[PDB]
Design a protein around this ligand. Structure first.
Ligand SMILES: [Mg+2]
Ligand SMILES: [Mg+2]
Ligand SMILES: [Mg+2]
Ligand SMILES: [Mg+2]
Ligand SMILES: [Mg+2]
Ligand SMILES: [Mg+2]
Ligand SMILES: [Mg+2]
Ligand SMILES: [Mg+2]
Ligand SMILES: [Mg+2]
Ligand SMILES: [Mg+2]
Ligand SMILES: [Mg+2]
Ligand SMILES: [Mg+2]
Ligand SMILES: [Mg+2]
Ligand SMILES: [Mg+2]
Ligand SMILES: [Mg+2]
Ligand SMILES: [Mg+2]
Ligand SMILES: [Mg+2]
Ligand SMILES: [Mg+2]
Ligand SMILES: [Mg+2]
Ligand SMILES: [Mg+2]
Ligand SMILES: [Mg+2]
Ligand SMILES: [Mg+2]
Ligand SMILES: [Mg+2]
Ligand SMILES: [Mg+2]
Ligand SMILES: [Mg+2]
Ligand SMILES: [Mg+2]
Ligand SMILES: [Mg+2]
Ligand SMILES: [Mg+2]
Ligand SMILES: [Mg+2]
Ligand SMILES: [Mg+2]
Ligand SMILES: [Mg+2]
Ligand SMILES: [Mg+2]
Ligand SMILES: [Mg+2]
Ligand SMILES: [Mg+2]
Ligand SMILES: [Mg+2]
Ligand SMILES: [Mg+2]
Ligand SMILES: [Mg+2]
Ligand SMILES: [Mg+2]
Ligand SMILES: [Mg+2]
Ligand SMILES: [Mg+2]
Ligand SMILES: [Mg+2]
Ligand SMILES: [Mg+2]
Ligand SMILES: [Mg+2]
Ligand SMILES: [Mg+2]
Ligand SMILES: [Mg+2]
Ligand SMILES: [Mg+2]
Ligand SMILES: [Mg+2]
Ligand SMILES: [Mg+2]
Ligand SMILES: [Mg+2]
Ligand SMILES: [Mg+2]
Ligand SMILES: [Mg+2]
Ligand SMILES: [Mg+2]
Ligand SMILES: [Mg+2]
Ligand SMILES: [Mg+2]
Ligand SMILES: [Mg+2]
Ligand SMILES: [Mg+2]
Ligand SMILES: [Mg+2]
Ligand SMILES: [Mg+2]
Ligand SMILES: [Mg+2]
Ligand SMILES: [Mg+2]
Ligand SMILES: [Mg+2]
Ligand SMILES: [Mg+2]
Ligand SMILES: [Mg+2]
Ligand SMILES: [Mg+2]
Ligand SMILES: [Mg+2]
Length: 97
RNA sequence: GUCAACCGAGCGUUGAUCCGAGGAUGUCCGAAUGGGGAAACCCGGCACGAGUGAUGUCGUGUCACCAGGCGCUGAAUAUAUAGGCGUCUGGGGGGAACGCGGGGAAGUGAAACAUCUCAGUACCCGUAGGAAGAGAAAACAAAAUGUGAUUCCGUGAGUAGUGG
RNA sequence: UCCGGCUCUACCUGGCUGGAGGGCAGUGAGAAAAUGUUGUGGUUAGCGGAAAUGGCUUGGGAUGGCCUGCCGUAGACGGUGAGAGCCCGGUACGUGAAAACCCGACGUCUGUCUUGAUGGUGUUCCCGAGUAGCAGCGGGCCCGUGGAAUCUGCUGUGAAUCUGCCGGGACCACCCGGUAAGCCUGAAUACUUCCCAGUGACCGAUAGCGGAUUAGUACCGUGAGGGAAUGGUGAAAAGUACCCCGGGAGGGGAGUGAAAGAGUACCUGAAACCGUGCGCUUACAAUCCGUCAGAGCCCUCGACGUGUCGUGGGGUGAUGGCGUGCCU
RNA sequence: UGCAUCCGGUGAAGCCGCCGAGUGAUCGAGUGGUGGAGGGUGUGGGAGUGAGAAUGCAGGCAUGAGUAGCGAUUAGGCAAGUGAGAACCUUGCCCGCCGAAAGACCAAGGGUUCCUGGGCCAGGCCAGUCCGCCCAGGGUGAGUCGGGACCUAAGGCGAGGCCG
């Protein structure tokens, strides 16, 4: 779905614009992803209970994958004649990911 | 799956969940169809297996009504029939409207009111279908040596007519 | 074309049925049952599907404002922190089904018939009966007995079969035109509980279906039946750690957040309504509660000094003139 | 709705004020404070288009007013305990009342109102530690009692049948 677990994504819209991070969990039922080190929020818990800062999810539409050349890019798909596997495309240059 | 989260356990690179096709599973009531009954609950007959010292006990199946046939039987009785069985195939109930068909009213208008109107409308009932119904003139027409099944549109026309 | 057997037997002429071969067509309303299958046809679900991190500004957050460049056979649509074709779902376009199912042909196999068919000169028991029509009684055709055809039918009656019938709007003659009492047969048409895709000068929570929410629920009625009210925190739960008052509820701080006069009784929060405070009025006053005058006090503003003028204001209103709400 | 297309997060609509202007219904590229997402000049077009009345409808809030009433004829006082608070609850002492009930069992009926534990917003016509409140847990043990295995009345259903 152009955004998977463990990828490298760059935030487009949001207070923590321009940061980088990994993908921890995807909420495809809600299309809302969670990225460590981005969109840092605070929380209050009363069980041991303190001001625990936790990571909140973002809409995937506000994030995108960054190519190895440090250039964020859309995603494209191919069908591998060798095995028929649908792979990623660095849309600007169409490499493999 | 959701409320709803949450955990807790956990599942996946061999491809788990997710979607689609076919299949199996489907307790009980419910046309209910083994009998009965206050629905979701009581009570049996028959055939095969199993366990107990045996019974007790267990599972599985089958067991309505009507219609139409088939085989067997046959009461008054003599022939034969009714009835009696047993077996195959159908139907049984539900569903918004539409269609057909059997039946079918008053409020109302008439400035009252019966004829009349309201109207063969509402409603009830029995049918099928995806449509139905109607359908190949015993029809019209009017001297033309004309039309040529049914059905549905717009006309013809609120005209000919009908009506205390 | 041929073969056989018949019209109670065997031998010319005449009238039928059965078998070898061109038909009639067939899942058919006019013969019945069987014999089996190919469209990138569609349906059931799917795949790809272009082109800005572009930069700066306000900005919480940009899709926004400005500047460039973008692609488009795709600038319908939805979402993302505010108006997004160049961010995602996706849009044109392309593509695709192992299996099953609805609509389209094609070689096993089946029936029939060519004992039947087409064209030419004269004399002698069949083709819809309790039916057509009739007397009475009623019904449907615009037609209510009216002068009343045609149709149907309840009861009694009841016909001809070709020089037969029935219709031609009472009814009759010549002629004029079409076969009743048996049967079936697609297309044009009506409808939508159900599904899909699209659209609306249709509503936007007292509207709109009764029902955007546990709704045909709560509830009412024993019954048939009736039948409600009740949407929005935030972009995201980040739903108020911790401290203090109090038993808690409730509340005040602290933090979250752009905002907590967004705190879950949660957008906006009006009016009736009930308060606090402030300025002024009111305890000799007879009444649709105002209007016209109108001093005083309060505050406001400019020319001008301590308050007086000035084409002065707003609030109050002491007192007096007039004054009998509104709709029917 | 149509439009040249614009207005606006440098604050739209909406709300509450103020100012000025039109003879009116109003208007203001007119603004101050809340609000934080849409409005729309002009010219047409179409309307569920303008509310005070209808003993209108639905919702909210008024007043009579902190007034009437707090639901019997049996009736209490007090000690101590719990608790923040104690007439109203727990324990104790006395008093009173029913005692063919105002006691004890069932049927019909209701269905967790039974017991234990916790808390008192909401409910109890007041407070309430209490409750028939709410929250959690527990609780119903039958060959011999009762309803089916049995039979039947009134009556209901009813194969065939009769009539419609
Ligand atoms: Mg399947
Ligand atoms: Mg299937
Ligand atoms: Mg099974
Ligand atoms: Mg039964
Ligand atoms: Mg049965
Ligand atoms: Mg038979
Ligand atoms: Mg006999
Ligand atoms: Mg049937
Ligand atoms: Mg009348
Ligand atoms: Mg009249
Ligand atoms: Mg009438
Ligand atoms: Mg009529
Ligand atoms: Mg059919
Ligand atoms: Mg037909
Ligand atoms: Mg006409
Ligand atoms: Mg795709
Ligand atoms: Mg900026
Ligand atoms: Mg832009
Ligand atoms: Mg612009
Ligand atoms: Mg668009
Ligand atoms: Mg948009
Ligand atoms: Mg997007
Ligand atoms: Mg008449
Ligand atoms: Mg006549
Ligand atoms: Mg004829
Ligand atoms: Mg016929
Ligand atoms: Mg048709
Ligand atoms: Mg509203
Ligand atoms: Mg009831
Ligand atoms: Mg802050
Ligand atoms: Mg409120
Ligand atoms: Mg609000
Ligand atoms: Mg005063
Ligand atoms: Mg005085
Ligand atoms: Mg006087
Ligand atoms: Mg007065
Ligand atoms: Mg006066
Ligand atoms: Mg006076
Ligand atoms: Mg703003
Ligand atoms: Mg503002
Ligand atoms: Mg403004
Ligand atoms: Mg706002
Ligand atoms: Mg607007
Ligand atoms: Mg216009
Ligand atoms: Mg206009
Ligand atoms: Mg109106
Ligand atoms: Mg009003
Ligand atoms: Mg009025
Ligand atoms: Mg009124
Ligand atoms: Mg009152
Ligand atoms: Mg009093
Ligand atoms: Mg009193
Ligand atoms: Mg009482
Ligand atoms: Mg006490
Ligand atoms: Mg006594
Ligand atoms: Mg007694
Ligand atoms: Mg006694
Ligand atoms: Mg009882
Ligand atoms: Mg009971
Ligand atoms: Mg108790
Ligand atoms: Mg307790
Ligand atoms: Mg309490
Ligand atoms: Mg109460
Ligand atoms: Mg409880
Ligand atoms: Mg019977």
């Amino acid at each position: 779905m152009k955004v998977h677990k463990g990828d490298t994504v760059l935030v487009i819209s949001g207070k923590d614009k321009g940061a980088k991070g990994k993908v921890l969990v995807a909420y495809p039922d809600r299309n809302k992803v969670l990225v460590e080190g981005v969109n840092r929020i605070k929380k209050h818990t009363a069980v041991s209970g303190g001001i625990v800062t936790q990571e909140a999810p973002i809409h995937v539409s506000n994030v995108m994958v960054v190519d190895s050349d440090g250039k964020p890019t859309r995603v494209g798909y191919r069908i591998d004649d060798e095995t028929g596997k649908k792979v990623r495309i660095a849309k600007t240059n169409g490499k493999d990911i």
